[PDB]
Amino acid sequence: DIRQTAGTGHKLRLAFSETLGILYLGVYLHTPKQGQFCVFQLMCAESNRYSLDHISSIFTNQETLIDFTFDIWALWLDDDNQTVVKHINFEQAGQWNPVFVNP
């Protein structure tokens, strides 16, 4: 899936939140067009078993993922040492903001 950027397939696939509940995850899927993300709930119970339950099936980004912190920060890699960062507010809805600078 590397295309022209050899070694970029090596990336984190799983992020967790800093919310002291620790109750949900972010997961990255790769696709021919740059991937998707999923969100899962974690339910813990007196039955002594933990459930991992789907919430967000799909989520759409842009450049080649380095790392992500899940509100979902996405940090991306491009050629010649280039970068882009993106935020998305999710509510099912998505508001998006990227990074671009011309100096």
Tab-separated table of all heavy atoms in Angstrom, unseen atoms left out:
chain	number	residue	atom	x	y	z
A	1	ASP	N	0.799	-1.212	0.000
A	1	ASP	CA	0.000	0.000	0.000
A	1	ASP	C	0.845	1.281	0.000
A	1	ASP	O	0.329	2.390	-0.151
A	1	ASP	CB	-0.938	-0.038	1.249
A	2	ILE	N	2.185	1.143	0.101
A	2	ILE	CA	3.161	2.223	0.248
A	2	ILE	C	3.197	3.230	-0.892
A	2	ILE	O	3.575	4.383	-0.705
A	2	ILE	CB	4.587	1.700	0.460
A	3	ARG	N	2.837	2.812	-2.124
A	3	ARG	CA	2.924	3.628	-3.320
A	3	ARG	C	4.345	4.107	-3.612
A	3	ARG	O	5.188	3.332	-4.052
A	3	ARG	CB	1.883	4.785	-3.330
A	4	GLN	N	4.628	5.400	-3.383
A	4	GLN	CA	5.942	5.980	-3.581
A	4	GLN	C	6.652	6.213	-2.254
A	4	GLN	O	7.827	6.565	-2.218
A	4	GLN	CB	5.792	7.341	-4.313
A	5	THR	N	5.981	5.997	-1.107
A	5	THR	CA	6.535	6.320	0.199
A	5	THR	C	6.836	5.052	0.971
A	5	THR	O	6.131	4.644	1.898
A	5	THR	CB	5.672	7.279	1.010
A	6	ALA	N	7.928	4.357	0.592
A	6	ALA	CA	8.349	3.121	1.221
A	6	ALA	C	8.593	3.222	2.730
A	6	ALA	O	9.256	4.130	3.222
A	6	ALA	CB	9.602	2.575	0.508
A	7	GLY	N	8.024	2.269	3.499
A	7	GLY	CA	8.092	2.257	4.961
A	7	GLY	C	6.941	2.946	5.650
A	7	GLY	O	6.831	2.897	6.868
A	8	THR	N	6.002	3.571	4.912
A	8	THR	CA	4.893	4.279	5.554
A	8	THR	C	3.747	3.383	5.982
A	8	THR	O	2.847	3.824	6.691
A	8	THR	CB	4.296	5.416	4.735
A	9	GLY	N	3.737	2.090	5.588
A	9	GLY	CA	2.758	1.107	6.068
A	9	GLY	C	2.904	0.761	7.537
A	9	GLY	O	1.948	0.353	8.201
A	10	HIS	N	4.117	0.953	8.090
A	10	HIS	CA	4.410	0.843	9.503
A	10	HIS	C	3.874	2.041	10.280
A	10	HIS	O	4.487	3.101	10.336
A	10	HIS	CB	5.934	0.739	9.756
A	11	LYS	N	2.700	1.882	10.908
A	11	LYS	CA	2.031	2.957	11.600
A	11	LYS	C	1.154	2.360	12.671
A	11	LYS	O	0.723	1.206	12.561
A	11	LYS	CB	1.143	3.779	10.627
A	12	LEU	N	0.849	3.129	13.737
A	12	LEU	CA	-0.109	2.726	14.744
A	12	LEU	C	-1.511	2.577	14.171
A	12	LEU	O	-1.940	3.296	13.270
A	12	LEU	CB	-0.131	3.669	15.970
A	13	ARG	N	-2.252	1.572	14.658
A	13	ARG	CA	-3.556	1.263	14.105
A	13	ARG	C	-4.642	1.524	15.108
A	13	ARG	O	-5.821	1.519	14.754
A	13	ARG	CB	-3.639	-0.241	13.760
A	14	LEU	N	-4.260	1.743	16.373
A	14	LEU	CA	-5.155	1.741	17.495
A	14	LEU	C	-4.804	2.927	18.356
A	14	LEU	O	-3.643	3.114	18.706
A	14	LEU	CB	-4.972	0.485	18.392
A	15	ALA	N	-5.804	3.726	18.742
A	15	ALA	CA	-5.606	4.772	19.711
A	15	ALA	C	-6.711	4.685	20.738
A	15	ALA	O	-7.792	4.135	20.505
A	15	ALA	CB	-5.588	6.160	19.045
A	16	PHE	N	-6.446	5.236	21.925
A	16	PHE	CA	-7.377	5.247	23.018
A	16	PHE	C	-7.414	6.659	23.522
A	16	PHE	O	-6.540	7.467	23.215
A	16	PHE	CB	-7.020	4.227	24.140
A	17	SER	N	-8.468	6.992	24.264
A	17	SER	CA	-8.635	8.330	24.766
A	17	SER	C	-8.040	8.545	26.128
A	17	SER	O	-7.804	7.627	26.914
A	17	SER	CB	-10.123	8.718	24.811
A	18	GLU	N	-7.818	9.820	26.436
A	18	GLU	CA	-7.284	10.290	27.677
A	18	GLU	C	-8.387	10.546	28.693
A	18	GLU	O	-8.139	10.830	29.859
A	18	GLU	CB	-6.508	11.601	27.418
A	19	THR	N	-9.671	10.396	28.290
A	19	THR	CA	-10.810	10.397	29.203
A	19	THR	C	-10.675	9.293	30.224
A	19	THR	O	-10.613	8.125	29.855
A	19	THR	CB	-12.156	10.131	28.522
A	20	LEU	N	-10.710	9.610	31.536
A	20	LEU	CA	-10.513	8.652	32.623
A	20	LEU	C	-11.498	7.489	32.665
A	20	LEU	O	-11.275	6.493	33.342
A	20	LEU	CB	-10.562	9.376	33.989
A	21	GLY	N	-12.602	7.560	31.890
A	21	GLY	CA	-13.450	6.413	31.615
A	21	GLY	C	-12.803	5.318	30.797
A	21	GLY	O	-13.137	4.156	30.975
A	22	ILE	N	-11.883	5.644	29.855
A	22	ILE	CA	-11.118	4.673	29.065
A	22	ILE	C	-12.023	3.699	28.274
A	22	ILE	O	-11.712	2.560	27.927
A	22	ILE	CB	-10.100	4.010	29.989
A	23	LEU	N	-13.231	4.165	27.927
A	23	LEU	CA	-14.301	3.257	27.590
A	23	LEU	C	-14.379	3.001	26.080
A	23	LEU	O	-15.209	2.213	25.642
A	23	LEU	CB	-15.658	3.858	28.085
A	24	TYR	N	-13.586	3.645	25.201
A	24	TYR	CA	-13.824	3.552	23.754
A	24	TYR	C	-12.495	3.644	22.993
A	24	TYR	O	-11.437	4.045	23.504
A	24	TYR	CB	-14.880	4.572	23.099
A	25	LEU	N	-12.483	3.196	21.744
A	25	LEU	CA	-11.283	3.166	20.963
A	25	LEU	C	-11.486	3.771	19.623
A	25	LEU	O	-12.611	3.920	19.133
A	25	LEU	CB	-10.895	1.711	20.751
A	26	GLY	N	-10.359	4.138	19.013
A	26	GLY	CA	-10.246	4.458	17.607
A	26	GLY	C	-9.377	3.453	16.889
A	26	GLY	O	-8.278	3.136	17.342
A	27	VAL	N	-9.852	2.938	15.740
A	27	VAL	CA	-9.157	1.956	14.903
A	27	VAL	C	-9.014	2.478	13.482
A	27	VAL	O	-9.954	3.057	12.939
A	27	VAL	CB	-9.878	0.602	14.855
A	28	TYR	N	-7.851	2.284	12.827
A	28	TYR	CA	-7.619	2.652	11.438
A	28	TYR	C	-7.672	1.441	10.503
A	28	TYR	O	-6.950	0.452	10.666
A	28	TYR	CB	-6.249	3.366	11.292
A	29	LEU	N	-8.511	1.548	9.459
A	29	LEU	CA	-8.552	0.665	8.312
A	29	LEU	C	-7.756	1.309	7.193
A	29	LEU	O	-7.774	2.525	7.026
A	29	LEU	CB	-9.997	0.466	7.785
A	30	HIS	N	-7.041	0.522	6.366
A	30	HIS	CA	-6.390	1.056	5.178
A	30	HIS	C	-7.269	0.740	3.982
A	30	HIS	O	-7.986	-0.256	3.963
A	30	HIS	CB	-4.970	0.512	4.912
A	31	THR	N	-7.267	1.599	2.949
A	31	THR	CA	-8.096	1.426	1.760
A	31	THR	C	-7.228	1.839	0.589
A	31	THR	O	-6.198	2.473	0.823
A	31	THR	CB	-9.418	2.231	1.718
A	32	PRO	N	-7.559	1.567	-0.676
A	32	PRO	CA	-6.825	2.115	-1.817
A	32	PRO	C	-6.790	3.632	-1.864
A	32	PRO	O	-5.868	4.194	-2.452
A	32	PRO	CB	-7.558	1.539	-3.037
A	33	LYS	N	-7.804	4.302	-1.287
A	33	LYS	CA	-7.857	5.738	-1.145
A	33	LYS	C	-7.715	6.122	0.318
A	33	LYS	O	-8.597	6.759	0.888
A	33	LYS	CB	-9.173	6.329	-1.709
A	34	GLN	N	-6.580	5.738	0.945
A	34	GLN	CA	-6.008	6.411	2.105
A	34	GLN	C	-6.592	6.089	3.470
A	34	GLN	O	-6.157	6.609	4.503
A	34	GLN	CB	-5.935	7.935	1.886
A	35	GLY	N	-7.489	5.099	3.525
A	35	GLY	CA	-7.998	4.554	4.769
A	35	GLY	C	-9.342	5.045	5.218
A	35	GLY	O	-10.015	5.841	4.574
A	36	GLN	N	-9.778	4.500	6.362
A	36	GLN	CA	-11.000	4.858	7.044
A	36	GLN	C	-10.714	4.678	8.526
A	36	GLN	O	-9.763	3.990	8.892
A	36	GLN	CB	-12.214	3.943	6.683
A	37	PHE	N	-11.521	5.263	9.426
A	37	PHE	CA	-11.403	4.997	10.853
A	37	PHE	C	-12.710	4.449	11.381
A	37	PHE	O	-13.779	4.711	10.839
A	37	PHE	CB	-11.035	6.219	11.742
A	38	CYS	N	-12.631	3.676	12.479
A	38	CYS	CA	-13.776	3.122	13.173
A	38	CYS	C	-13.709	3.507	14.635
A	38	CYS	O	-12.626	3.723	15.186
A	38	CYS	CB	-13.829	1.570	13.102
A	39	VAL	N	-14.872	3.588	15.311
A	39	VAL	CA	-14.953	3.849	16.745
A	39	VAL	C	-15.711	2.714	17.418
A	39	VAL	O	-16.767	2.292	16.939
A	39	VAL	CB	-15.605	5.192	17.081
A	40	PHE	N	-15.176	2.190	18.541
A	40	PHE	CA	-15.737	1.078	19.300
A	40	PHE	C	-15.995	1.464	20.744
A	40	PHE	O	-15.150	2.110	21.353
A	40	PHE	CB	-14.737	-0.101	19.375
A	41	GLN	N	-17.128	1.050	21.346
A	41	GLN	CA	-17.369	1.107	22.777
A	41	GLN	C	-16.841	-0.133	23.474
A	41	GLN	O	-16.813	-1.224	22.905
A	41	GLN	CB	-18.878	1.211	23.113
A	42	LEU	N	-16.407	-0.001	24.729
A	42	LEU	CA	-15.983	-1.069	25.593
A	42	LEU	C	-16.945	-1.050	26.750
A	42	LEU	O	-17.133	-0.035	27.421
A	42	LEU	CB	-14.549	-0.905	26.165
A	43	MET	N	-17.594	-2.190	27.000
A	43	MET	CA	-18.510	-2.338	28.102
A	43	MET	C	-17.948	-3.370	29.048
A	43	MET	O	-17.624	-4.491	28.654
A	43	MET	CB	-19.907	-2.799	27.637
A	44	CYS	N	-17.828	-3.013	30.334
A	44	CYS	CA	-17.324	-3.878	31.377
A	44	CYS	C	-18.467	-4.174	32.322
A	44	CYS	O	-19.374	-3.358	32.478
A	44	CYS	CB	-16.169	-3.222	32.172
A	45	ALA	N	-18.487	-5.370	32.937
A	45	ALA	CA	-19.673	-5.813	33.631
A	45	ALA	C	-19.346	-6.812	34.723
A	45	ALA	O	-18.306	-7.474	34.728
A	45	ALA	CB	-20.650	-6.467	32.629
A	46	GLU	N	-20.295	-6.967	35.659
A	46	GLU	CA	-20.290	-7.829	36.822
A	46	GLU	C	-20.355	-9.308	36.469
A	46	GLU	O	-20.083	-10.188	37.281
A	46	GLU	CB	-21.478	-7.460	37.753
A	47	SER	N	-20.657	-9.611	35.195
A	47	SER	CA	-20.618	-10.938	34.611
A	47	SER	C	-19.201	-11.459	34.408
A	47	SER	O	-18.998	-12.645	34.146
A	47	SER	CB	-21.349	-10.949	33.241
A	48	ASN	N	-18.186	-10.565	34.526
A	48	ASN	CA	-16.758	-10.847	34.456
A	48	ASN	C	-16.299	-10.983	33.012
A	48	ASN	O	-15.376	-11.733	32.692
A	48	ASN	CB	-16.262	-12.056	35.302
A	49	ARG	N	-16.958	-10.272	32.081
A	49	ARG	CA	-16.673	-10.352	30.666
A	49	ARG	C	-16.806	-8.955	30.118
A	49	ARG	O	-17.593	-8.152	30.617
A	49	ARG	CB	-17.660	-11.288	29.908
A	50	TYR	N	-16.009	-8.620	29.089
A	50	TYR	CA	-15.971	-7.285	28.532
A	50	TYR	C	-16.445	-7.380	27.101
A	50	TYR	O	-16.033	-8.271	26.361
A	50	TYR	CB	-14.536	-6.678	28.533
A	51	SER	N	-17.332	-6.465	26.675
A	51	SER	CA	-17.828	-6.420	25.306
A	51	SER	C	-17.164	-5.283	24.567
A	51	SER	O	-16.886	-4.235	25.137
A	51	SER	CB	-19.366	-6.251	25.180
A	52	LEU	N	-16.865	-5.497	23.273
A	52	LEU	CA	-16.307	-4.490	22.384
A	52	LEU	C	-17.267	-4.227	21.230
A	52	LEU	O	-17.389	-5.049	20.318
A	52	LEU	CB	-14.952	-4.960	21.799
A	53	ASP	N	-17.962	-3.079	21.239
A	53	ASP	CA	-19.185	-2.878	20.489
A	53	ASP	C	-19.043	-1.726	19.498
A	53	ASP	O	-18.515	-0.659	19.790
A	53	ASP	CB	-20.378	-2.692	21.468
A	54	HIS	N	-19.457	-1.941	18.234
A	54	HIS	CA	-19.314	-0.970	17.158
A	54	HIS	C	-20.108	0.310	17.338
A	54	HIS	O	-21.231	0.301	17.838
A	54	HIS	CB	-19.748	-1.533	15.787
A	55	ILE	N	-19.550	1.448	16.890
A	55	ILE	CA	-20.247	2.725	16.893
A	55	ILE	C	-20.129	3.321	15.508
A	55	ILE	O	-21.087	3.358	14.745
A	55	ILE	CB	-19.698	3.678	17.938
A	56	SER	N	-18.924	3.790	15.127
A	56	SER	CA	-18.734	4.445	13.844
A	56	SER	C	-18.100	3.460	12.904
A	56	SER	O	-16.983	3.001	13.138
A	56	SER	CB	-17.858	5.724	13.904
A	57	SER	N	-18.843	3.082	11.849
A	57	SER	CA	-18.417	2.164	10.800
A	57	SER	C	-17.347	2.741	9.891
A	57	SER	O	-16.383	2.070	9.535
A	57	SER	CB	-19.634	1.748	9.927
A	58	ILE	N	-17.500	4.018	9.491
A	58	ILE	CA	-16.635	4.626	8.501
A	58	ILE	C	-16.349	6.053	8.873
A	58	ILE	O	-17.111	6.724	9.572
A	58	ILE	CB	-17.181	4.623	7.070
A	59	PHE	N	-15.195	6.548	8.413
A	59	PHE	CA	-14.753	7.878	8.700
A	59	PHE	C	-13.731	8.211	7.637
A	59	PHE	O	-12.879	7.371	7.363
A	59	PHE	CB	-14.091	7.820	10.087
A	60	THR	N	-13.738	9.415	7.031
A	60	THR	CA	-12.941	9.654	5.821
A	60	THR	C	-11.924	10.755	6.017
A	60	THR	O	-12.222	11.864	6.467
A	60	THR	CB	-13.790	9.972	4.599
A	61	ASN	N	-10.651	10.466	5.682
A	61	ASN	CA	-9.526	11.344	5.912
A	61	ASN	C	-8.881	11.799	4.588
A	61	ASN	O	-9.602	12.071	3.635
A	61	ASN	CB	-8.585	10.705	6.973
A	62	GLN	N	-7.543	11.984	4.511
A	62	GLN	CA	-6.889	12.392	3.269
A	62	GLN	C	-5.478	11.816	3.183
A	62	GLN	O	-5.294	10.773	2.583
A	62	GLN	CB	-6.907	13.929	3.082
A	63	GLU	N	-4.423	12.435	3.762
A	63	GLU	CA	-3.070	11.967	3.484
A	63	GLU	C	-2.647	10.739	4.284
A	63	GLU	O	-3.338	10.250	5.179
A	63	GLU	CB	-2.006	13.099	3.557
A	64	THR	N	-1.491	10.148	3.920
A	64	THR	CA	-0.995	8.888	4.480
A	64	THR	C	-0.679	8.959	5.954
A	64	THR	O	0.258	9.615	6.390
A	64	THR	CB	0.231	8.351	3.751
A	65	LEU	N	-1.471	8.247	6.777
A	65	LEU	CA	-1.380	8.234	8.226
A	65	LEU	C	-0.012	7.900	8.829
A	65	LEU	O	0.581	6.880	8.484
A	65	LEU	CB	-2.470	7.276	8.763
A	66	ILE	N	0.473	8.758	9.759
A	66	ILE	CA	1.587	8.495	10.671
A	66	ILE	C	1.021	7.964	11.966
A	66	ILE	O	1.347	6.865	12.418
A	66	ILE	CB	2.352	9.786	11.003
A	67	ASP	N	0.131	8.764	12.570
A	67	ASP	CA	-0.293	8.599	13.928
A	67	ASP	C	-1.609	9.338	14.070
A	67	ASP	O	-1.912	10.268	13.311
A	67	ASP	CB	0.779	9.216	14.865
A	68	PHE	N	-2.427	8.948	15.045
A	68	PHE	CA	-3.701	9.567	15.291
A	68	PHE	C	-4.008	9.504	16.765
A	68	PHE	O	-3.691	8.544	17.463
A	68	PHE	CB	-4.865	8.988	14.433
A	69	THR	N	-4.664	10.543	17.287
A	69	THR	CA	-5.022	10.575	18.693
A	69	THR	C	-6.496	10.871	18.732
A	69	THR	O	-6.968	11.833	18.127
A	69	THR	CB	-4.247	11.590	19.510
A	70	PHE	N	-7.276	10.017	19.410
A	70	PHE	CA	-8.719	10.066	19.382
A	70	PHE	C	-9.220	10.403	20.777
A	70	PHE	O	-9.216	9.560	21.671
A	70	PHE	CB	-9.240	8.679	18.888
A	71	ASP	N	-13.485	13.625	18.923
A	71	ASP	CA	-12.477	14.485	18.381
A	71	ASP	C	-11.389	13.545	17.911
A	71	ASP	O	-10.926	12.683	18.662
A	71	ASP	CB	-12.050	15.347	19.596
A	72	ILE	N	-10.984	13.616	16.635
A	72	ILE	CA	-9.893	12.782	16.170
A	72	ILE	C	-8.870	13.603	15.426
A	72	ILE	O	-9.069	14.114	14.323
A	72	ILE	CB	-10.353	11.527	15.425
A	73	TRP	N	-7.686	13.718	16.049
A	73	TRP	CA	-6.492	14.197	15.410
A	73	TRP	C	-5.954	13.169	14.456
A	73	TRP	O	-5.761	12.013	14.827
A	73	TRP	CB	-5.353	14.440	16.422
A	74	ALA	N	-5.643	13.570	13.220
A	74	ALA	CA	-4.951	12.710	12.299
A	74	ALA	C	-3.687	13.412	11.839
A	74	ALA	O	-3.738	14.545	11.363
A	74	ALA	CB	-5.888	12.370	11.125
A	75	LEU	N	-2.514	12.762	11.987
A	75	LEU	CA	-1.235	13.298	11.573
A	75	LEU	C	-0.762	12.471	10.407
A	75	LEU	O	-0.766	11.237	10.445
A	75	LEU	CB	-0.172	13.206	12.703
A	76	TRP	N	-0.374	13.137	9.310
A	76	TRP	CA	-0.121	12.473	8.057
A	76	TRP	C	1.254	12.784	7.494
A	76	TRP	O	1.862	13.810	7.781
A	76	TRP	CB	-1.169	12.893	7.015
A	77	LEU	N	1.762	11.861	6.660
A	77	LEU	CA	3.064	11.899	6.036
A	77	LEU	C	2.918	11.987	4.544
A	77	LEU	O	2.058	11.344	3.945
A	77	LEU	CB	3.846	10.594	6.314
A	78	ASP	N	3.796	12.771	3.921
A	78	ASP	CA	3.821	12.944	2.503
A	78	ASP	C	5.308	12.970	2.148
A	78	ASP	O	6.156	12.872	3.044
A	78	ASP	CB	2.999	14.218	2.201
A	79	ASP	N	5.679	13.001	0.853
A	79	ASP	CA	7.065	13.011	0.409
A	79	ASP	C	7.837	14.293	0.758
A	79	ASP	O	7.326	15.179	1.433
A	79	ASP	CB	7.249	12.464	-1.034
A	80	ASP	N	9.153	14.358	0.444
A	80	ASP	CA	10.067	15.453	0.769
A	80	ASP	C	9.969	16.060	2.179
A	80	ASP	O	10.178	17.250	2.406
A	80	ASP	CB	10.023	16.508	-0.362
A	81	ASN	N	9.683	15.198	3.178
A	81	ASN	CA	9.552	15.515	4.594
A	81	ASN	C	8.268	16.290	4.934
A	81	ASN	O	8.105	16.803	6.047
A	81	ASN	CB	10.821	16.170	5.218
A	82	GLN	N	7.297	16.340	4.007
A	82	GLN	CA	6.036	17.038	4.113
A	82	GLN	C	5.078	16.413	5.129
A	82	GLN	O	5.142	15.236	5.482
A	82	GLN	CB	5.413	17.182	2.697
A	83	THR	N	4.172	17.242	5.675
A	83	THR	CA	3.197	16.834	6.670
A	83	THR	C	1.905	17.551	6.424
A	83	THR	O	1.872	18.599	5.779
A	83	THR	CB	3.657	17.180	8.075
A	84	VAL	N	0.811	17.017	6.976
A	84	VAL	CA	-0.470	17.676	7.061
A	84	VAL	C	-1.063	17.141	8.360
A	84	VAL	O	-0.849	15.982	8.712
A	84	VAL	CB	-1.379	17.332	5.884
A	85	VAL	N	-1.803	17.970	9.121
A	85	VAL	CA	-2.529	17.531	10.301
A	85	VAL	C	-3.989	17.849	10.039
A	85	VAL	O	-4.311	18.763	9.283
A	85	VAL	CB	-2.069	18.194	11.605
A	86	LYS	N	-4.926	17.091	10.627
A	86	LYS	CA	-6.334	17.364	10.460
A	86	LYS	C	-7.063	17.085	11.750
A	86	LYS	O	-6.705	16.183	12.508
A	86	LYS	CB	-6.925	16.501	9.311
A	87	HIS	N	-8.117	17.876	12.007
A	87	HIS	CA	-9.062	17.661	13.076
A	87	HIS	C	-10.398	17.405	12.458
A	87	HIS	O	-10.732	17.978	11.416
A	87	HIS	CB	-9.317	18.943	13.873
A	88	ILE	N	-11.201	16.576	13.124
A	88	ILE	CA	-12.579	16.415	12.762
A	88	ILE	C	-13.387	16.355	14.039
A	88	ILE	O	-13.090	15.561	14.928
A	88	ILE	CB	-12.838	15.148	11.960
A	89	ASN	N	-14.452	17.181	14.139
A	89	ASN	CA	-15.461	17.017	15.172
A	89	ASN	C	-16.507	16.048	14.652
A	89	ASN	O	-17.056	16.280	13.577
A	89	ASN	CB	-16.267	18.307	15.491
A	90	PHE	N	-16.818	14.972	15.388
A	90	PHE	CA	-17.863	14.024	15.041
A	90	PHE	C	-18.981	14.178	16.069
A	90	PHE	O	-18.727	14.411	17.244
A	90	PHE	CB	-17.260	12.581	14.980
A	91	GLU	N	-20.260	14.085	15.660
A	91	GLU	CA	-21.388	14.233	16.574
A	91	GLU	C	-22.269	13.016	16.425
A	91	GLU	O	-22.286	12.375	15.377
A	91	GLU	CB	-22.235	15.489	16.283
A	92	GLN	N	-24.465	11.021	13.729
A	92	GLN	CA	-23.364	10.848	12.789
A	92	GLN	C	-23.181	12.087	11.920
A	92	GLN	O	-24.045	12.422	11.109
A	92	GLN	CB	-23.598	9.618	11.911
A	93	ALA	N	-22.052	12.765	12.094
A	93	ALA	CA	-21.756	13.959	11.332
A	93	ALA	C	-20.274	14.212	11.435
A	93	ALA	O	-19.614	13.634	12.291
A	93	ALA	CB	-22.496	15.195	11.885
A	94	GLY	N	-19.703	15.075	10.570
A	94	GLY	CA	-18.282	15.379	10.627
A	94	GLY	C	-17.988	16.775	10.151
A	94	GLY	O	-18.329	17.136	9.029
A	95	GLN	N	-17.307	17.587	10.977
A	95	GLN	CA	-16.831	18.905	10.577
A	95	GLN	C	-15.331	18.857	10.456
A	95	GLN	O	-14.666	18.436	11.400
A	95	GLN	CB	-17.049	20.004	11.642
A	96	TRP	N	-14.742	19.299	9.334
A	96	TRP	CA	-13.333	19.092	9.102
A	96	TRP	C	-12.498	20.360	8.966
A	96	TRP	O	-12.942	21.381	8.445
A	96	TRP	CB	-13.123	18.177	7.879
A	97	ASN	N	-11.239	20.305	9.455
A	97	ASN	CA	-10.290	21.397	9.353
A	97	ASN	C	-8.888	20.845	9.006
A	97	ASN	O	-8.396	20.058	9.824
A	97	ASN	CB	-10.132	22.067	10.745
A	98	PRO	N	-8.181	21.151	7.914
A	98	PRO	CA	-6.822	20.646	7.686
A	98	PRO	C	-5.753	21.682	8.067
A	98	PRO	O	-6.060	22.720	8.652
A	98	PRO	CB	-6.826	20.391	6.165
A	99	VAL	N	-4.472	21.413	7.730
A	99	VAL	CA	-3.355	22.345	7.856
A	99	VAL	C	-2.796	22.594	6.469
A	99	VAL	O	-2.421	21.660	5.763
A	99	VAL	CB	-2.202	21.797	8.703
A	100	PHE	N	-2.703	23.867	6.051
A	100	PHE	CA	-2.035	24.245	4.824
A	100	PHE	C	-1.436	25.627	5.060
A	100	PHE	O	-2.077	26.492	5.652
A	100	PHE	CB	-3.034	24.253	3.631
A	101	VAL	N	-0.181	25.857	4.620
A	101	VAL	CA	0.541	27.100	4.852
A	101	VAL	C	1.313	27.425	3.583
A	101	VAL	O	1.993	26.567	3.029
A	101	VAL	CB	1.539	27.009	6.017
A	102	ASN	N	1.238	28.684	3.101
A	102	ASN	CA	1.998	29.152	1.958
A	102	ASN	C	2.873	30.324	2.421
A	102	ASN	O	2.320	31.386	2.709
A	102	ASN	CB	0.998	29.581	0.846
A	103	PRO	N	4.201	30.196	2.523
A	103	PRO	CA	5.035	31.286	3.020
A	103	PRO	C	6.091	31.702	1.997
A	103	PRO	O	6.628	30.876	1.262
A	103	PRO	CB	5.681	30.643	4.255
